Design an enzyme around this catalytic site. Structure first.
Site, PDB file in Angstrom:
ATOM      1  N   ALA A  43      37.771  30.696  80.087  1.00  0.00           N
ATOM      2  CA  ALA A  43      38.804  31.246  79.217  1.00  0.00           C
ATOM      3  C   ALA A  43      40.000  30.311  79.108  1.00  0.00           C
ATOM      4  CB  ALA A  43      39.246  32.613  79.728  1.00  0.00           C
ATOM      5  N   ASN A  67      46.699  40.804  84.124  1.00  0.00           N
ATOM      6  CA  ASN A  67      45.882  40.659  85.321  1.00  0.00           C
ATOM      7  C   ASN A  67      46.607  41.022  86.612  1.00  0.00           C
ATOM      8  OD1 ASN A  67      47.490  38.311  84.813  1.00  0.00           O
ATOM      9  ND2 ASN A  67      46.338  37.231  86.409  1.00  0.00           N
ATOM     10  N   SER A 103      36.137  35.625  79.801  1.00  0.00           N
ATOM     11  CA  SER A 103      35.591  34.830  80.897  1.00  0.00           C
ATOM     12  C   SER A 103      34.553  35.614  81.689  1.00  0.00           C
ATOM     13  CB  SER A 103      36.710  34.363  81.836  1.00  0.00           C
ATOM     14  OG  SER A 103      36.229  33.411  82.767  1.00  0.00           O
ATOM     15  N   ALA A 104      33.377  35.006  81.883  1.00  0.00           N
ATOM     16  CA  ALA A 104      32.221  35.729  82.414  1.00  0.00           C
ATOM     17  C   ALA A 104      32.413  36.141  83.872  1.00  0.00           C
ATOM     18  CB  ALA A 104      30.962  34.882  82.267  1.00  0.00           C
ATOM     19  N   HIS A 105      33.053  35.295  84.681  1.00  0.00           N
ATOM     20  CA  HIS A 105      33.133  35.551  86.124  1.00  0.00           C
ATOM     21  C   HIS A 105      34.129  36.659  86.469  1.00  0.00           C
ATOM     22  CE1 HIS A 105      37.091  33.768  87.234  1.00  0.00           C
ATOM     23  NE2 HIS A 105      36.909  33.106  86.106  1.00  0.00           N
ATOM     24  N   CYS A 128      59.926  43.250  89.811  1.00  0.00           N
ATOM     25  CA  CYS A 128      61.372  43.273  89.942  1.00  0.00           C
ATOM     26  C   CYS A 128      61.882  44.702  90.064  1.00  0.00           C
ATOM     27  CB  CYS A 128      62.045  42.582  88.745  1.00  0.00           C
ATOM     28  SG  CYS A 128      63.830  42.824  88.636  1.00  0.00           S
TER      29      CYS A 128
END
Lengths: 382, 388
Positions: A73, A155, A203-205, A328
């Site tokens: 990615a 993420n 992204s595959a992983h 924060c």
């Protein structure tokens, strides 16, 4: 006793044994180059066809659209950003790119380099909910803005972005829309026509596929100057011999991801909810981001008096794998997502589950989390 | 008459079972991300270190030098060419790149795109021996040349380039030297210090490694603007999560290639010579390039009456996998007809049959291939009225 438990699935995931079994033949039994004409090369063609069909079905792309297989990615983000810069800024009448401050480094550092190339980029700051709203990008688009790049889901916090509304606003003003959908595949429903995006990275992983293979979705085959020139691989959009095992495993993993999302979302979500409820029962703990707009597998908890890295270390010593997340302090008191580059930022502990997490792992993790909080609070200056 | 025989190893190779066995754990058993701090991520660190050490030892690089793992040699070539364009041409005092007409498309199309960006590129034509000599590059280097990119060995003819002398000319004139060494690993001794090269591209699936992993060697960590920005992977030179299985298998395959090099020079060369001598027994057949400067596993044969693609198809129906190579007709100083290498884009180019062996080729395969090659030549010459 001591038990190894993996909850850092947002960083990478275990390869599903079914995915690895689907990949196995394409190293030694079936090894021909797919662009060759002899039977050795063409032997893998039905497998490549099936893998591409699985990917098209998994993200709901249509036949006019393109799905270019990248190495990761990061490659997809570099390709989209630098290609739109080359097409519409260096050889166009544009000079502006819109993104957020909480994007993956593959987006942030590339945009910083593009800034070094004279491109104006507005990194939209993020709200309490861990999101950027569509009216903000709408106010920030000019007549020289070339691209809006906003991740589908974050993420660190797991917060889901309103991709459909941002796409609508971008289409009305006529500016291309790219989304980093790595955190979307396997965790939320993915329909790239309903989301209205022009480009999507994945992204595959991250959904139990192999490392070393990624993808870029392009709507209606939009022109995008190739990042890798050479032969006419992937319809002449990305040269280099095809990663046959990567493609096969990626297709299998994407199909399996949509399957376990459609029948088995309650299991991962129930376990995440159990773990998060148990952790927030400890005094002076806060989970960042609202749960009802967060992926079913992610928790980001900030513990008071303890530091996130020390909690991560003590957990790893207990066999529990987790990660960090920037947060924060604020009022409305809440702990909120913030760019890593802030001076008011402290590190919270990120716990991300998968379809392989067991309830015993969750019980052990709850017990050990309480143990670590009490033990590290016992040594704190505060 | 059907027995499957693979003689297209210059295009791709079978993954050595030992390489796949070395790769196996790093899908499901050991899957943590190496950039994480927990034990799951760090578990693969010794394996990554050992694989990088194998690569350094296999190409003879030094500790000061860098070996950046790319996704493929195409990535490495694009990276080197576009990076030197960005560093020394767009943000430098250069505007010239020297290369050959026989490069892989990953070099040639990138140079064409750079020409679309205003860069002057000299595609050096190739000599009778199918190589470019160092005095030619010497004639073509100026004070505005940014990079000379010449492949180490050609993938169609197997001719080896005098890379060390070309490097000397480049060192004298102070110009950077990149070589596409994909066809060198496992077939010729590779010492990037003896070769005097500044950059080298290579791809694992050409020496029995897995597809999806390649590498770029950089001398002394020479500055080269990253093609993929982001995290500090590979020393901050190429972002993206590491292809751990790819790296492990690539290291194992490169070690195995360095081990098998003398096997490939003795036995595989004997088998290649057997096949080539048997083919040259057919009247009006010509092997392109001198064997004494050719990699031990490659033959490029031009047949007179027959067309190359029909020969390839007839071979594949007999279970034999081969490829194409561009050649044109000329004479030697003997004034005898010979077939010589030429760029694929020439209008005087015709297709010759390329047969490339590996350390897995058997003498049974070679005997069967000899028989089927003669059969196909006779069959396609029997159908033409012009062949004399």
């Amino acid at each position: 006793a001591h038990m190894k438990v993996y909850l850092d699935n947002n960083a990478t995931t275990i390869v599903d044994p079914e995915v690895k079994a689907a990949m196995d033949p394409y190293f030694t039994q079936i090894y021909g180059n797919p662009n060759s004409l002899h039977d050795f090369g063409t032997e893998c063609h039905p497998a490549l066809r099936k893998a591409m069909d699985q990917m098209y079905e998994a993200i709901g792309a249509r036949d006019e659209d393109d799905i270019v297989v990248t190495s990761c990615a990061t490659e997809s983000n570099n390709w989209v950003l630098k290609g739109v810069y080359f097409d519409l800024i260096k050889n166009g009448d544009k000079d502006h790119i819109i993104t957020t401050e909480v994007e993956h480094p593959s987006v942030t550092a590339t945009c910083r380099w593009l800034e070094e190339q004279g491109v104006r980029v507005t990194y939209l700051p993020v709200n309490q909910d861990g999101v950027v709203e569509a009216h903000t990008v709408r106010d920030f688009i000019t007549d020289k803005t070339a691209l809006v790049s906003i991740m589908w889901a974050n993420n660190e916090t797991g917060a889901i972005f309103p991709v459909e509304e941002i796409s609508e606003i971008c289409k009305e003003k006529g500016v291309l829309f790219h989304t980093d959908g790595v955190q979307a595949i396997g965790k939320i429903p993915v329909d790239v026509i309903r989301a209205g995006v022009d480009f999507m990275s994945f992204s595959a992983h991250k959904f139990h596929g192999p490392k070393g293979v990624g993808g870029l979705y392009i709507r209606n085959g939009h022109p995008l100057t190739s990042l890798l020139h050479g032969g006419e691989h992937m319809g002449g959009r990305r040269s280099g011999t095809l990663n046959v095992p990567g493609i096969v495993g990626m297709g299998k993993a994407m199909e399996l991801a949509t399957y376990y999302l459609k029948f088995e979302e309650e299991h991962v979500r129930k376990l995440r909810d159990k773990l998060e409820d148990a952790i927030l029962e400890i005094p002076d703990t806060y989970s960042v981001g609202p749960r009802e707009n967060r992926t079913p597998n992610t928790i980001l908890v900030s513990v008071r008096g303890v530091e996130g890295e020390a909690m991560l270390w003590d957990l790893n010593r207990a066999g529990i794998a987790a990660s960090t997340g920037s947060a924060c302090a604020s009022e409305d008191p809440i702990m909120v997502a913030v760019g890593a580059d802030s001076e008011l930022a402290h590190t919270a502990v990120r716990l991300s589950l998968s379809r392989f997490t067991t309830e015993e792992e969750i019980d052990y993790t709850i017990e050990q989390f309480k143990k670590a909080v009490e033990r590290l609070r016992s040594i704190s200056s505060s």
